[PDB]
Each structure stands twice: as structure tokens, then as C-alpha cells.
Design a protein around this ligand. Structure first.
Ligand SMILES: [Mg+2]
Ligand SMILES: [Mg+2]
Lengths: 388, 388
């Protein structure tokens, strides 16, 4: 398996996909998925990757606009004409001239995996396993399933009615989702979790996602939520309040899960060393690409830390990168991955990811974009920048 | 002292100042200081603040261009018409809609201090002391001098000759600087530090700045540099390698100083708790403004952690914010602040900061922009955006 390719051409598409289900985002409405697609060309081969920042700067400070700037003016010109010897060398290359900006780096890094996967006629999953192996990931954690399990994510209902949330819990069960997580924030916490737990039974995989909206001195609220016996509480405090997150964990029975805190493998290293949390969420976009995600996977599995996969979400294309990764043994709870048909309508996503009885199967074909036709890409978006 | 004001108008200037001394920046040449100046208007009063990002994304990932985007499209519109009740409430306001992007937030936050200082006819230093006091900073650390000491920062000479560095050490002593720090990186380390130490004598305040260019497994190189007996090593490892930085500190005699790692007061909290480092550098731009800097000051002085002030550097305007702050007792080594005359020529900086026998005196007049005429601002830059 060769990991080298020459970057003969690069292009940037802005894709726009109408949401069949406008959902409550973190800054209001959201009728449409608006994303960037990086196209890397070697000869006649093309790799594609997605950067999916928000339009508002509430997540790491990056926006669609700043991501365009970084990509057009710095990152895409830097890689043009380059001939990296490996995935690791390409990772070094893209980080060199650009710190932060993980969404921009992710779209470029993922496109390179796609290009290499296709050039080698091999599945993403296969490349990931090999990389894992080369990095010295423990044999037990090179094992995998051929699917990921899929969980529902439920917001806080705009009418503040528990029954509106509960109607959605019922729909999620009927739809086949294998796990539910519900949004919480101070004042919308113990009650919704209580009514949810009983709508699904103690047995059903359930967790909260507070989106950092609590502080440690509100710990008693978590104490009260211990009765719902959920699997963990996802990111309850500020992403930089690492010791507070460890301390909360010591005051309650329900474990604490990190999402926003885990911004890189370097951070993962010392978070593992300090025993801040035993349950980590992995979002490829958050960490700036797949290799970084894999390095984090090694650190977690080296330390008995349980993983599960999440997404921003991106389009089906970005999700492909997570889908291959998230089937490995390290991943032990259902992932947040959007089933194409539900959110965009059948066939309307950039690529189709299908949920059957709460499972999404891992593609065996090469790379991420095997089933993306150029004309479908051109139908969903426009080339906004290019250079040869 | 009122801390409230209504934001009747906001403007953005791009200033451009020809460097009399083009210096070796982190991405090549640098003939000119290019910065942004935020103007906030209440009635007939104006506050000014500087955002000074680099043009390339090697520092936190923010650039002049992304900073413009964030400011124009998000931050400046958000504050227009607002009437914050305090500096703390304005800080909350600017962080709400925008995470990361510390340079953008800093220019806006500082402009608000300037506006409030002028409206109250009081010195920045006086407002800082009061805020410090309100935050419960220990009485001993409300003490201050009426000047800061100024240190030289020397780069790695392009010809790789030790004598070229040493000629610069001699010039720095003749110029009156009270401290020298020299750039290092692997392969340019023990020798330059050795030749520097003796050119100045064991007595002279001296430290290294590796700009994160080493890893922990290169620790023996630091061991060898212990003979030069300098005050500390500034940011020797990656900014996110916190435990590695603590560990390096345990393997050598020379203390480790944090710069890039200290990105916020939340991070400062747990870095203090963990005893990563006993010597911290404070850059107002890095932490996103003066209140954040003050919160970090409290954490350090609460824990016996020694401080010193640094700058990006900005223009004289940005430096004003540091100059008032850095005179307090917590600051125990000379600061990196550019003397206007040296770098731009006399009177050519946006505002003039004068070094006399290696000291820069703290202004007693109100705020930061007391001596900045509108026509001088218009001579150094252009209004590029505004809204009323
Ligand atoms: Mg999450
Ligand atoms: Mg420094």
C-alpha cells in the first residue's frame, strides 16, 4: 500500500443541501446543510473531503467564511504540486503553515485519505486498520464489526413541554435507533431525563448532552440525575475546565464524557494521564482529521478508555470517514451519524448512508467517494475556487 | 467609577506602519506593522483598541484576514447599540457569540476599557487596580511601580554566526535594556546561550525562547544549558504538552516558563493547580483582553507564580494596555515592549512609548489613546468598515 501522491490540482466546492428536517441548531434555525468539499487531483484520480464548520463562530471560533479564507489563501495553495510520501507526512505538511483551523485541515486531510484509498483500490476501513497497526494499536483493538450502531440526538423542545420531548423519544424507538441522548441545560435537566428514562426503561442506552452549560458548583443537579442511571453525562462543563470535570466525576455515580475538551491527540495524552474521564467522544472534524482521530483512538484503547463516534454533523461524505473508523472495537456505544434519507430525503445527500434496524454498514468499496458521481456533486454545489 | 456606556458607533481602521528595523519574523520578512484598530463611540467620546494578528496562521490559527471577517460580520455588529453595565458584562457579551478568535476579542475588549477610562477621566492603571481589588487580588499585589523594565529579544542570526548574535547582545547592553532573551531551536542552543551568558556575565537577566521547537526527549540539551544559569526557559515544548513541560522542569535546574500554553484564565486555573510551571508570561492579545489578563494575574499571584509581560508585538496602542498592567508587583522580570523610536522612528508609532535607561513609564493620563490624535490615526491607516 503506497501512501504517496502528487497534488496536481485542487478545487473547492461549496455544497448546499436542503434539510428535510430543519432542526434546532445552537444559533437558531437551520433549513440547509452548507459545507465545503475539497477536491484533490492526481492525474485522473480524485479524492474528496468535507469541511463542515458552522456559519457562526460558536464552535472553536471557526466559521464557513474563515474556513474559506484559510483554505483559499493558505492551505490549498500550500499543498498544490506537493508530493507527500505518506499520510503522516501530509499531516505534518498541513499543520506546518497552519495552526488551529481544524475544519479546514480536516477537509484537506480526509480528501487525501480518499485519494490514497482509491489509488490503491482499498477500503477506508482497511487503510485505517493498517495505520492503527503501524502505530502499535493493541491487537484486541484492531478487531471490528462491519457496521456501526446509530443513536438519536434529541434537543430541548421550544415549547418547554416534557410531552413534546417524549413524543420524540417514542418516534426514535419506532425508527429503530439503538440509543438516545437528550439535550440539557440548567433548569431543563432532572425532569426531562426522568421522563425519558421511564419512556424507554432502565435498560435503554441513554445519556445527556449539556453542551458545557453547567458549572461544578451545580453538581448537586447531577447528583439528582443519578437516579435516571444513564450511561454518562456528555460534556457537562466548560471544555477547558478539565480538573472540574474530573472533580464532578468524583462527586456523582454517573460517569463524565468528554467531547469538546478533546481537541487533539496531545491534549488526549495528558487527559488520559490525569484520569479526567473514562469515556471520550471522537469527532474527526473537531480533531482536524482521521490520523489525529486514530492517534486518539490508540491513546484511549491503551488506557481502557471507552469511545463512541459523533459528527457535527457533516454531509454523508464527512460521515464516511467516521463510519469506517467507528466500527473498530474501541467504539462501544452507538454513534451520532445522520441517516441520509431522514434528513435530506432519499438520494439527496452527497453520498447515501443508510440506517437499517439502527445500524449503518461500513462500505467495502474504496475510500469515501466511491459512489459520488461528479454530476451529483455539481448538482449539490458549485466550484468556488481552484488552482493547478 | 461607572463601567457602563452605550455603543452608539463602531469603526474599524487598518493601520500600516513602516518598520525602521525589519526583523526576522516567524514566517520570513516583515518590513511593516499591519494592524487593526477598533473605534467605539459613545456620544462624542471614543475608545480605541488594537487587534494585532499575524498575516499567516502560525499563531492560534488567526490571521489579519480571518480577524477582519470575525470583526466585520460578527463581533462589531453584535456590540452596536448595546449598553453593557460593566467591563465584566461586556466581556461576557463579546464571548457569547464568538469562541476562540482572541485577537478580534482583544481589540474590542481593550477599546471598551479605553472608552470607560476616558469617560471617567482616569488612568488605565487606576482602573486595573480597582478591578484587581474588586476581584479579591491580595493586598500585596495591588502594589506597583510607576514604570516597567524593558528587555531585548534577540533572534537566531541568518548567517548562523555566534558573533552576529554577540554583536547584538553588545548593542542591547549599550541601548540600556535590562534583560536579554535569545531565540533557540534544536542545533542552535547550548553554544549561543553559552557565548551570550559570558558576554553579559552570570549576573545579567537572561532567558531562552525556544518557541515550542523542542520535545521532552531532547531534555538532555536543556541539561547542558543548565551551566548558563539563566532565569528560565520560555515555552520550550509544544503548547499543549502540559505534563511534558512539568516533567522537563523536574529533569533540570533551570525553571520552565509558559507563554503559548496560557491561553485563558480557565486554563491558568488548572495549570496552577497542577504545578506545571512557576513562571508565566502574560500577553493580553493571546488571552483575548485585559480582564482575562487580570484574572490570570490573580491566579498567578494567589499561587506565588512569577509573572512577566510580553507583546506580539502590537503598535504602541496595544502596548499601552500591557504597560499599565505590567507595573504591578506580580510582574518581576523585564517585559517585551517595543520602544516606539527604535522600531518606527520617533513620533511614527500610533502612540509613543519611550524607553529611558531601560524603563518605560506608566502613563497617568486617562486610558490608552489620550495622546493619539485623530489625524495621526488617519495618517497611519484607513477606516475600512463602520456602522452606526
Ligand atoms: Mg457533544
Ligand atoms: Mg514567547
Amino acid at each position: 500500500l503506497t501512501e504517496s501522491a502528487r497534488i496536481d490540482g485542487v478545487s473547492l466546492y461549496e455544497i448546499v443541501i436542503p434539510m428535510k428536517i430543519p432542526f434546532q441548531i445552537s444559533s437558531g434555525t437551520c433549513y440547509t446543510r452548507r459545507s465545503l468539499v475539497v477536491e484533490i487531483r492526481e492525474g485522473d484520480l480524485f479524492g474528496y473531503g468535507e469541511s463542515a464548520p458552522f456559519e457562526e463562530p460558536f464552535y472553536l471560533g471557526e466559521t464557513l467564511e474563515t474556513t474559506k479564507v484559510i483554505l483559499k489563501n493558505h492551505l490549498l495553495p500550500m499543498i498544490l504540486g506537493k508530493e507527500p510520501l505518506s499520510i503522516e507526512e501530509f499531516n505534518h505538511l498541513i499543520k506546518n503553515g497552519i495552526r488551529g483551523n481544524h475544519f479546514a485541515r480536516c477537509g484537506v486531510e480526509n480528501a487525501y485519505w480518499d485519494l490514497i484509498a482509491k489509488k490503491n483500490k482499498i477500503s477506508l476501513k482497511a487503510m485505517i486498520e493498517k495505520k492503527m497497526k503501524n502505530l502499535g494499536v493493541k491487537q484486541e483493538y484492531l478487531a471490528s464489526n462491519n457496521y456501526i450502531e446509530s443513536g438519536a440526538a434529541l434537543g430541548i423542545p421550544e415549547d418547554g413541554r416534557i410531552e413534546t420531548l417524549i413524543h420524540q423519544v417514542e418516534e426514535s424507538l419506532q425508527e429503530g435507533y439503538r440509543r438516545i441522548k437528550i439535550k440539557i441545560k440548567p433548569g431543563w435537566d432532572v425532569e426531562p431525563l426522568q421522563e425519558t428514562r421511564r419512556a424507554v426503561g432502565d435498560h435503554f442506552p441513554l445519556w445527556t448532552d449539556a453542551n458545557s452549560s453547567f458549572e461544578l458548583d451545580q453538581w448537586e443537579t447531577f447528583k439528582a440525575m443519578d437516579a435516571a442511571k444513564c450511561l454518562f453525562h456528555e460534556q457537562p462543563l466548560h471544555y477547558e475546565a478539565l480538573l472540574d470535570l474530573k472533580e464532578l466525576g468524583e462527586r456523582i455515580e454517573t460517569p463524565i464524557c468528554l467531547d469538546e475538551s478533546l481537541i487533539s491527540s496531545r491534549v488526549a495524552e495528558f487527559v488520559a494521564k490525569l484520569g479526567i474521564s473514562n469515556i471520550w467522544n471522537i469527532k474527526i472534524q473537531r480533531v482536524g482529521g482521521l490520523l489525529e482521530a486514530i492517534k486518539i483512538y490508540k491513546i484511549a484503547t491503551d488506557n481502557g478508555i471507552k469511545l463512541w463516534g459523533g459528527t457535527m454533523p457533516e454531509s454523508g461524505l464527512g460521515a464516511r470517514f467516521l463510519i469506517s473508523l467507528a466500527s473498530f472495537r474501541g467504539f462501544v456505544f452507538p454513534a451520532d451519524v445522520a441517516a441520509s434519507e431522514k434528513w435530506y430525503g432519499k438520494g439527496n445527500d452527497l453520498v447515501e448512508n443508510t440506517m437499517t434496524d439502527g445500524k449503518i454498514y461500513v462500505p467495502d468499496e474504496p475510500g469515501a467517494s466511491f459512489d459520488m458521481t461528479l454530476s451529483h456533486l455539481e448538482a449539490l454545489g458549485k466550484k468556488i475556487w481552484e488552482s493547478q
